[PDB]
Design an enzyme around this catalytic site. Structure first.
Site, mmCIF file in Angstrom:
data_model
loop_
_atom_site.group_PDB
_atom_site.id
_atom_site.type_symbol
_atom_site.label_atom_id
_atom_site.label_comp_id
_atom_site.label_asym_id
_atom_site.label_seq_id
_atom_site.Cartn_x
_atom_site.Cartn_y
_atom_site.Cartn_z
ATOM 1 N N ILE A 17 0.850 -1.200 0.000
ATOM 2 C CA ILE A 17 0.000 0.000 0.000
ATOM 3 C C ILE A 17 0.884 1.248 0.000
ATOM 4 O O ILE A 17 0.688 2.161 -0.800
ATOM 5 C CB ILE A 17 -0.944 -0.041 1.255
ATOM 6 C CG1 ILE A 17 -2.010 -1.167 1.138
ATOM 7 C CG2 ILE A 17 -1.578 1.343 1.556
ATOM 8 C CD1 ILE A 17 -2.789 -1.491 2.477
ATOM 9 N N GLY A 18 1.812 1.287 0.945
ATOM 10 C CA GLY A 18 2.692 2.420 1.157
ATOM 11 C C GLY A 18 4.006 2.039 1.789
ATOM 12 O O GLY A 18 4.228 0.882 2.157
ATOM 13 N N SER A 19 4.902 3.013 1.851
ATOM 14 C CA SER A 19 6.242 2.890 2.415
ATOM 15 C C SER A 19 6.763 4.272 2.726
ATOM 16 O O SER A 19 6.275 5.264 2.169
ATOM 17 C CB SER A 19 7.185 2.177 1.445
ATOM 18 O OG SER A 19 7.321 2.913 0.242
ATOM 19 N N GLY A 20 7.735 4.324 3.626
ATOM 20 C CA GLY A 20 8.375 5.559 4.048
ATOM 21 C C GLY A 20 9.448 5.283 5.075
ATOM 22 O O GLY A 20 9.144 4.863 6.196
ATOM 23 N N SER A 22 12.018 3.276 6.906
ATOM 24 C CA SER A 22 12.219 1.873 7.280
ATOM 25 C C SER A 22 10.881 1.131 7.408
ATOM 26 O O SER A 22 10.851 -0.022 7.838
ATOM 27 C CB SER A 22 13.008 1.788 8.585
ATOM 28 O OG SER A 22 14.240 2.488 8.516
ATOM 29 N N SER A 23 9.762 1.847 7.101
ATOM 30 C CA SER A 23 8.405 1.327 7.188
ATOM 31 C C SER A 23 7.765 0.999 5.838
ATOM 32 O O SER A 23 8.064 1.644 4.833
ATOM 33 C CB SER A 23 7.517 2.313 7.938
ATOM 34 O OG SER A 23 8.005 2.496 9.254
ATOM 35 N N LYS A 24 6.860 -0.005 5.842
ATOM 36 C CA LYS A 24 6.039 -0.462 4.707
ATOM 37 C C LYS A 24 4.661 -0.865 5.239
ATOM 38 O O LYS A 24 4.578 -1.388 6.353
ATOM 39 C CB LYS A 24 6.669 -1.699 4.029
ATOM 40 C CG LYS A 24 8.004 -1.436 3.335
ATOM 41 C CD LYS A 24 8.581 -2.694 2.720
ATOM 42 C CE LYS A 24 9.936 -2.413 2.113
ATOM 43 N NZ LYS A 24 10.695 -3.664 1.868
ATOM 44 N N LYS A 39 1.452 -2.939 8.993
ATOM 45 C CA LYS A 39 2.571 -2.016 8.939
ATOM 46 C C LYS A 39 3.779 -2.777 9.508
ATOM 47 O O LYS A 39 3.719 -3.366 10.602
ATOM 48 C CB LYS A 39 2.284 -0.709 9.702
ATOM 49 C CG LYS A 39 3.469 0.268 9.751
ATOM 50 C CD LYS A 39 3.033 1.634 10.222
ATOM 51 C CE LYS A 39 4.212 2.550 10.451
ATOM 52 N NZ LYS A 39 3.789 3.940 10.809
ATOM 53 N N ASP A 133 0.924 17.791 12.040
ATOM 54 C CA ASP A 133 1.186 17.536 10.627
ATOM 55 C C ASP A 133 -0.019 16.880 9.929
ATOM 56 O O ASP A 133 0.155 15.960 9.131
ATOM 57 C CB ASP A 133 2.488 16.718 10.454
ATOM 58 C CG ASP A 133 2.997 16.638 9.021
ATOM 59 O OD1 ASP A 133 2.935 17.668 8.306
ATOM 60 O OD2 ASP A 133 3.400 15.541 8.601
HETATM 61 C C1 O38 Z 1 -6.910 3.423 -4.445
HETATM 62 N N1 O38 Z 1 -6.210 3.450 -3.164
HETATM 63 C C2 O38 Z 1 -6.542 2.705 -2.050
HETATM 64 C C3 O38 Z 1 -5.615 3.050 -1.076
HETATM 65 C C4 O38 Z 1 -5.514 2.576 0.271
HETATM 66 C C5 O38 Z 1 -4.743 3.282 1.195
HETATM 67 C C6 O38 Z 1 -4.627 2.866 2.503
HETATM 68 C C7 O38 Z 1 -5.289 1.710 2.929
HETATM 69 N N2 O38 Z 1 -5.115 1.300 4.262
HETATM 70 C C8 O38 Z 1 -4.161 1.665 5.191
HETATM 71 C C9 O38 Z 1 -4.251 1.040 6.457
HETATM 72 C C10 O38 Z 1 -3.289 1.324 7.384
HETATM 73 C C11 O38 Z 1 -2.269 2.210 7.075
HETATM 74 C C12 O38 Z 1 -1.262 2.462 8.017
HETATM 75 N N3 O38 Z 1 -0.433 2.671 8.781
HETATM 76 C C13 O38 Z 1 -2.259 2.821 5.801
HETATM 77 N N4 O38 Z 1 -1.299 3.732 5.486
HETATM 78 C C14 O38 Z 1 -1.244 4.405 4.193
HETATM 79 C C15 O38 Z 1 0.216 4.680 3.816
HETATM 80 C C16 O38 Z 1 0.332 5.492 2.536
HETATM 81 C C17 O38 Z 1 -0.427 6.802 2.668
HETATM 82 C C18 O38 Z 1 -1.891 6.526 2.968
HETATM 83 C C19 O38 Z 1 -2.021 5.725 4.257
HETATM 84 N N5 O38 Z 1 -3.200 2.549 4.849
HETATM 85 C C20 O38 Z 1 -6.061 0.997 2.033
HETATM 86 C C21 O38 Z 1 -6.169 1.434 0.706
HETATM 87 O O1 O38 Z 1 -6.955 0.751 -0.230
HETATM 88 C C22 O38 Z 1 -7.461 -0.545 0.092
HETATM 89 C C23 O38 Z 1 -6.285 -1.397 0.132
HETATM 90 N N6 O38 Z 1 -5.356 -2.070 0.159
HETATM 91 C C24 O38 Z 1 -4.756 4.008 -1.682
HETATM 92 N N7 O38 Z 1 -5.131 4.243 -2.957
#
Ligand code: O38
Ligand code: MG
Ligand code: MG
Ligand code: MG
Length: 272
Positions: A17-20, A22-24, A39, A133
């Site tokens: 979904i994401g990274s930053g 040392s985290s994913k 996470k 923030d």
């Molecule tokens: C079309 N789209 C969907 C997303 C999305 C974004 C986030 C999440 N769920 C989570 C659940 C927990 C965390 C944490 N910690 C997290 N972090 C993200 C990191 C990147 C920036 C947005 C938040 N995201 C689920 C998401 O979608 C369902 C899935 N997998 C982003 N773009």
């Protein structure tokens, strides 16, 4: 393909979904094929300040589970000297990705999202936490409800892409006092979160952040702190929403509306 174990429970990774730093964050499935977000923090090269920020974020997230349902669910976690695993609800989409895809926002959905954010931020303020923030990426949409994901204590993550990246954070939600504090007293207060919430609601009302037009960074920072720089508030049918925005975006934090005041405001109270 990859898999992982958290407190004796196995999960298979569907995507990142994401990274930053040392985290994913991964979208995963348990044995029952139920969806979660995990996470992962790699602690191998982390300093004692970085370590304590991850420890403090976990302690606050876990403590605040019982105080509001507008805070992301943390089901379980594993912490060693080498890593951290946090099992959370996955949700549908973060508020930033949702706002970038949406053309028009329903006044009822904008109001409902506003109430969820106020409640989440109010809960953290009651436990002595100021995010400082806040951005739309800090909020998760879970079945039409907004939930605060993090408390601004640990490093921020950006969403991942499956394409090769070419060249970063946002300055659009930064309070005017966060800028003034850098030269110099604590400075920071719950009012800094009100300004950032105001910028999010301004985005949900006018389709842009108050200083989105200013591409240049030094000129943007100048405009946020300048009292002579008049923020535009074009007339809209929701007169209460127009007042919320003007009160959230006052440059003097002492004059800026508070969260308890925002919760008693007609915008949130009149017509349910
Ligand atoms: C079309 N789209 C969907 C997303 C999305 C974004 C986030 C999440 N769920 C989570 C659940 C927990 C965390 C944490 N910690 C997290 N972090 C993200 C990191 C990147 C920036 C947005 C938040 N995201 C689920 C998401 O979608 C369902 C899935 N997998 C982003 N773009
Ligand atoms: Mg994408
Ligand atoms: Mg792309
Ligand atoms: Mg693409």
């Amino acid at each position: 393909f990859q898999s992982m174990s958290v407190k004796g429970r196995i999960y298979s990774i569907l995507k990142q979904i994401g990274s930053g730093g040392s985290s994913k964050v991964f979208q995963v499935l348990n044995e029952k094929k139920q969806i979660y977000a995990i996470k992962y923090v790699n602690l191998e090269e982390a300093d004692n300040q970085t370590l304590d920020s991850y420890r403090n974020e976990i302690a606050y997230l876990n403590k605040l589970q019982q105080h509001s349902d507008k805070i992301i669910r943390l089901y379980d976690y594993e912490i060693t000297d080498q890593y951290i695993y946090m099992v959370m609800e996955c949700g549908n989409i973060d508020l930033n990705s949702w706002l970038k895809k949406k053309k028009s926002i329903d006044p009822w959905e904008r109001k409902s999202y506003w109430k969820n954010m106020l409640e989440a931020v109010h809960t953290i303020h009651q436990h002595g936490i100021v995010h400082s923030d806040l951005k739309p990426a800090n909020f998760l949409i879970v079945d039409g409800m907004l939930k605060l994901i993090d408390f601004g204590i640990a490093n921020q993550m950006q969403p991942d892409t499956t394409s090769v990246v070419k060249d970063v954070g946002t300055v659009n939600y930064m309070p005017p006092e966060a800028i003034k504090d850098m030269s110099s007293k604590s400075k920071i207060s719950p009012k800094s979160d009100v300004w950032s919430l105001g910028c999010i609601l301004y985005y949900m009302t006018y389709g842009k952040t108050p200083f989105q037009q200013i591409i240049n960074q030094i000129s943007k920072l100048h405009a946020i702190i300048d009292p002579n720089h008049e923020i535009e508030f074009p007339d809209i049918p929701e007169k209460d929403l127009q007042d919320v925005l003007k009160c959230c975006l006052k440059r003097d934090p002492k004059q800026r509306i508070s969260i308890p005041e925002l919760l008693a405001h007609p915008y949130v109270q009149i017509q349910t």
